Design a protein around this ligand. Sequence first.
Ligand SMILES: CCCCCC(=O)OC[C@H](COP(=O)(O)O)OC(=O)CCCCC
Ligand SMILES: CCCCCC(=O)OC[C@H](COP(=O)(O)O)OC(=O)CCCCC
Ligand SMILES: CCCCCC(=O)OC[C@H](COP(=O)(O)O)OC(=O)CCCCC
Ligand SMILES: CCCCCC(=O)OC[C@H](COP(=O)(O)O)OC(=O)CCCCC
Ligand SMILES: CCCCCC(=O)OC[C@H](COP(=O)(O)O)OC(=O)CCCCC
Ligand SMILES: CCCCCC(=O)OC[C@H](COP(=O)(O)O)OC(=O)CCCCC
Lengths: 47, 47, 47, 47, 48, 48
Amino acid sequence: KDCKRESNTFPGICITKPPCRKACIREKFTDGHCSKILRRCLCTKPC
Amino acid sequence: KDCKRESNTFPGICITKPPCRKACIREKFTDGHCSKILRRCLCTKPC
Amino acid sequence: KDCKRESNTFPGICITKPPCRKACIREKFTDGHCSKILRRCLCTKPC
Amino acid sequence: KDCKRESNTFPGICITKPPCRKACIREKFTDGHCSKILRRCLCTKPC
Amino acid sequence: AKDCKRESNTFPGICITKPPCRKACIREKFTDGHCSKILRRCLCTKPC
Amino acid sequence: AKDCKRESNTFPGICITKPPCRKACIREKFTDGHCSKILRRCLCTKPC
Ligand SMILES: CCCCCC(=O)OC[C@H](COP(=O)(O)O)OC(=O)CCCCC
Ligand SMILES: CCCCCC(=O)OC[C@H](COP(=O)(O)O)OC(=O)CCCCC
Ligand SMILES: CCCCCC(=O)OC[C@H](COP(=O)(O)O)OC(=O)CCCCC
Ligand SMILES: CCCCCC(=O)OC[C@H](COP(=O)(O)O)OC(=O)CCCCC
Ligand SMILES: CCCCCC(=O)OC[C@H](COP(=O)(O)O)OC(=O)CCCCC
Ligand SMILES: CCCCCC(=O)OC[C@H](COP(=O)(O)O)OC(=O)CCCCC
């Protein structure tokens, strides 16, 4: 399974995936996705 | 902030910290804690 | 474009699409999706 | 519960209701109202 | 002589419905308040 | 925070430049006035 950490750079409410993914790759993770409930951008990468 | 990944070795319900921390350090993380709701053992390490 | 209405039969909170789609098809709509903040099951069909 | 979808015939910006309702009734809905931010004309009808 | 008007100095966030804006504006000693339809500011009004 | 604003009751015609509007508004016991950008109304301003 992957490691996960909230994005430090993504601003505002996480609505769609691509912007979150882009922030997370800029933060040297491999993907990102919006949290379904709190709408935070969560980055993921192999641990 | 630290990365998080659920423990792959901790059995059953996460009640207190020490057993989860011990499992997570064996998995080469630096700490572990119980998730307050689902009672999963969550390993943490800098990433 | 499609008309949209909240599901009358979907119980609980909308987490993933397929359970919502299933309920919406039961109600004679063609698809369903989760609303992003309130997590409602919203059915869609041709108007 | 009413079905909703954007007017296909209402031109321009929805400021007040009557012109949107009128367009929506022409489109065989039963009412219309402006959306708050985008100022779309949204038609509604029993579904 | 229409009413005097200015933006609420206490209403937070986006003005969506009228009652919360009117409530803020009466606390500021105006007689009413309403959301501006385009910018969604809470605007207070009073005879003046 | 911002001043109260109200259309002038005495300013005739269309608001082109500020000084004639400011002068009419001070007569009306406001502290300033200015032209609205599109409709070219003379808008008077004063603390609420
Ligand atoms: C598919 C297009 C229309 C329906 C979309 C919808 O209902 O939102 C997706 C919902 C969840 O909502 P969001 O992830 O917040 O967009 O359910 C899923 O199946 C995604 C599952 C988890 C994805 C990781
Ligand atoms: C009934 C006679 C006409 C009154 C016109 C009016 O109410 O303004 C139009 C409103 C405009 O929206 P507001 O920002 O709420 O003023 O839209 C509606 O259709 C009502 C509900 C949705 C609000 C967008
Ligand atoms: C009527 C309650 C909805 C919340 C406040 C409101 O009156 O209208 C907001 C509208 C939604 O109005 P509804 O169609 O009823 O959902 O949407 C927007 O903000 C802009 C466009 C996107 C969605 C239409
Ligand atoms: C006639 C309906 C009841 C009261 C008036 C009203 O509709 O709301 C105040 C209006 C609405 O516009 P906003 O305040 O920007 O929302 O203010 C004006 O711009 C007109 C002032 C006059 C100069 C343009
Ligand atoms: C309302 C005028 C106030 C200030 C002067 C101005 O705005 O320039 C236009 C002036 C205004 O004159 P009046 O309309 O007579 O007031 O010249 C014209 O009338 C031609 C337009 C014909 C309009 C009927
Ligand atoms: C930013 C304020 C809103 C604009 C209204 C205003 O200031 O009224 C005066 C007008 C405004 O006209 P605009 O160019 O359209 O802004 O300016 C003048 O030319 C007067 C010269 C002397 C002083 C400007």
